[PDB]
Amino acid sequence: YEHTAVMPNKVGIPYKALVERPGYAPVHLQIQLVNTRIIPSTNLEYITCKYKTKVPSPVVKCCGATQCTSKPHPDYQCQVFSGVYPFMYGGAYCFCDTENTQMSEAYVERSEECSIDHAKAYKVHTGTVQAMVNITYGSVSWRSADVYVNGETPAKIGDAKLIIGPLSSAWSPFDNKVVVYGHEVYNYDFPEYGTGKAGSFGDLQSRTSTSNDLYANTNLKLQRPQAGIVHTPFTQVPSGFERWKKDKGAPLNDVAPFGCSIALEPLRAENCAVGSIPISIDIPDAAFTRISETPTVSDLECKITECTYAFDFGGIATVAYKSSKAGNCPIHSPSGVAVIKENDVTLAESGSFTFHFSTANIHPAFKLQVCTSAVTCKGDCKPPKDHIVDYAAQHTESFTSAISATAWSWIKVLVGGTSAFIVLGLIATAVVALVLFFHRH
């Protein structure tokens, strides 16, 4: 039997319903999401990391001159400094006083840390949505499996076939461009490859951490060696990756709305409480028992013994009943006024049973279904004492949930009196208008 319904996109809050198959006793169904994962499709654009400046041994030409040539090296620099007279540990290196040249060379490489300490720039496109669903029904214990939240792919969970509809909201916390560094994700419109500026995030760009074509854009400039010293001095703009790591700011992990939890393997946003999720579950035909084979419950009377509209199961109610064929009978409240903690109760030939519920209404009025029967529960609920709690609300608050009977009474008096004032004035006008007509005629 296929049961179709819509459940909210909430994690840790179970969805409860009664599967009512004509001719069979209701089968209690409970569907709880363990996690919801939005897994977008990503394409690695390039990898950024701290650069290393490689400086080969300078060519010191004594009594002569040399010339620089271009080479296929990132940010390659070459300059010939004439008029040098370097000294070594063994004395003057060159003979001529000024007819000597030192050719300095330098180029940018990926540092050793780039294998581990680097940021991956990704293009993010709409991907897939998956969830872990925990389901129990009738006398079948909790079973779970990974499912695809697409409304098409069915999943077999404990002999039951579950189809989870697509999320009503297509919202995703990732922008078209994200930067992944370590365990953190940043929404960052990184520069296109080959466009990174010196001292900025993209100063060093590589298509992959093992590529042999590196883009480097630093103001690497060779300076003249100090008088008499064989060395290759240079100036360069400090690494824009090191700068970025200082100024990264808040990661997406700390600013994603709806409480999303960001994971990287694969990149995904977990437990985003957005919209609702249509569902369809085909319950096995063996889970249903004929009406005549289940207990008949009658003379139901529901008394609310205690109630507070707290986020926990603050309500307590006692239901008196009369029955036959003592046995288990499911309990459910079809309306959103109250969420019942217990899923089923054991009924004797006569007596009473108690159940707990959570409600946001100051004067809750809800229907309670006891298998083949139902009763209406009414009462008053006190305000909760705790200002802050460490758990989410089980119930749902409606527009009129907070309006007390006293507030309704004042609204009725307001509208009734206000309307009567205008109505009486209009009637008086109509009566005098008729009298004036009869005066003329």
Partner 1 sequence: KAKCIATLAPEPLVEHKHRTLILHLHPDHPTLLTTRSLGSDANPTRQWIERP
Ligand X SMILES: *[C@@H]1O[C@H](CO)[C@@H](O)[C@H](O)[C@H]1NC(C)=O
Q: Please give the helix or strand (H or E) that residue 105 lies within, else none.
A: strand 101-110
Q: How many Å apart are CA 206 and CA 118, to the nearest integer?
A: 10
Q: Which two tokens stand for residue 79?
A: 């300059």
Considering CB distances under 5 to 8 angstroms, the limit depending on partner class, which of partner 1, ligand X, none binds residue 393?
A: none
For ligand X, the closer of residues 162 and 319 by Cβ is 162
**Block residue for tokens 């010939």:** 80
- Nearest distance, CB of residue 387 and partner 1, angstroms: 4
When asked if residue 256 is in the footprint of partner 1 (CB under 8 A), the reply is yes
Q: Which residue has the tokens 């419950």?
A: 297
Radius of gyration of the chain (CA): 38
- Give 36's contacts (C-beta < 8 A, 6+ positions apart): 9, 11, 129, 130, 131, 149, 270, 271, 272
Pairing of β 160-164 and β 155-157 = antiparallel
* Binding flag, residue 415, ligand X (CB under 6 A): no
What is the closest distance, in whole angstroms, from the C-beta atom of residue 159 to ligand X in the complex? 16
The number of residues that bind ligand X (CB under 6 A) is 4
Told to check if 246 binds partner 1 by CB under 8 A, we report no
Minimum Å distance from CB 412 to ligand X? Answer: 45
Which of ligand X, partner 1, none binds 254 (CB below 5-8 Å, type-dependent)? partner 1
Q: How far apart are CA 290 and CA 344, in angstroms?
A: 18
Residue 30 binding ligand X, by CB under 6 A? no
Could you give the C-alpha distances from 43 to 125, 175, 269, 286, in angstroms and in order? Answer: 8, 13, 17, 48
Q: Is residue 408 a contact residue for ligand X (CB under 6 A)? A: no
Tokens linked to 179? 């930067």
Minimum distance of ligand X from residue 130's CB (angstroms): 14
- Using CB under 8 A as the binding rule, whether residue 257 contacts partner 1 is answered as yes
Site string for ligand X, 264-303 (x = CB under 6 A): ----------------------------------------
Question: Residue 148 binds what, of ligand X, partner 1, none (CB under 5 to 8 Å, by partner type)?
Answer: none
Of the residues 57, 69, 70, 250, which one makes contact with partner 1 according to CB under 8 A: 250
